[PDB]
Amino acid sequence: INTVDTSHEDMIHDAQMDYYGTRLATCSSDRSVKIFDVRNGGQILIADLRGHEGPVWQVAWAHPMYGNILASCSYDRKVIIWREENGTWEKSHEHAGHDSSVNSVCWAPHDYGLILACGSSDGAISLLTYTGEGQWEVKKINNAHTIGCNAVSWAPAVVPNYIKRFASGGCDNLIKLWKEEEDGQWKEEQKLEAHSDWVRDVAWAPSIGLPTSTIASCSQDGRVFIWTCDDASSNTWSPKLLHKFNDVVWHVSWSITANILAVSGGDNKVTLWKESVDGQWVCIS
């Protein structure tokens, strides 16, 4: 059980490793993004990143497809990408085309390309599609949500030349699905209106081939819903329920084959759920 002795200033805010499991990333309020290498166990410092306009919330490592890339979504108008080229960590690009403070950064499936979504707390969205010269293509939409929209997640690349989809939510006690049309502008579709107080985590679930596409939700109502769909043609997003824990629920993460839905919240602990044959979700640890 390897441990990384924290050395930042303020309380840590996030952690996300690399694809092969070789590096780290530590967003914080100390503005430090100090990356640690964990090869064979131990602490180094390949980068002691600095420079933002506010505390950083969420980082998101991109695919090795396109080289070492890290993203930051500080309480700012900063979306900085840090390319770490020529064997040295360094800044590469920033974009301030959003008035409010972003709270989500979720990379797209690698089959499409290199697309980033980062929705701020204004009710807008953005796609930073890479072009092939060294410039982005940032497009947006004027409105998506009433007051929040702080969580965004992507949908597995399936089907036959691709029909892109992704999920958002966090403002109107709601969650919406955006399927972009053949023109290029994000249309809209149904919105899953079955939540109570204030949602925070809006993640999705990896696909394997089974037509049962699922999606979770963690909120301030204390409830967690594991939606389900028999197919994509019936759209019967039937809300089930797993628990009604007392405190606030913060984050939900899936496993590589969706046999775990680990939940962390205000109780300052980690719970490791898993569903049985009867369909009821039970704890393990």
Inter-residue long-range contacts of 164-169, CB under 8 Å, 24+ positions, other chains counted: 164/108, 164/112, 166/106, 166/108, 166/117, 167/202, 167/204, 167/215, 168/119, 168/125, 168/144, 168/202, 169/145, 169/199, 169/202, 169/217
As measured in angstroms, the least distance from the Cβ of 20 to other proteins is: 5
Q: Is 260 exposed, middle or buried (0-12, 13-18, 19+ CB in 10 A)?
A: middle
Residue 159 interacting with other proteins (CB under 8 A): no
The site map against other proteins for 202-241 (x = CB under 8 A) is ----------------------------------------
Identity of the residue, 21 or 87, whose beta carbon is nearer to other proteins in the bound complex: 21
Residue 256 interacting with other proteins (CB under 8 A): yes
CB contact set of 65 (below 8 Å; sequence gap of 6+): 110, 114
**Among residues 15, 19, 66, 198, which is the contact residue for other proteins, using CB under 8 A?**
19
As measured in angstroms, the least distance from the Cβ of 125 to other proteins is: 27
Identity of the residue, 22 or 236, whose beta carbon is nearer to other proteins in the bound complex: 22
Residue 20 interacting with other proteins (CB under 8 A): yes
Identity of the residue, 196 or 257, whose beta carbon is nearer to other proteins in the bound complex: 257
Pair 62, 71: CB distance under 8 Å: yes
Q: Which residues bind other proteins (CB under 8 A)?
A: 19-20, 256
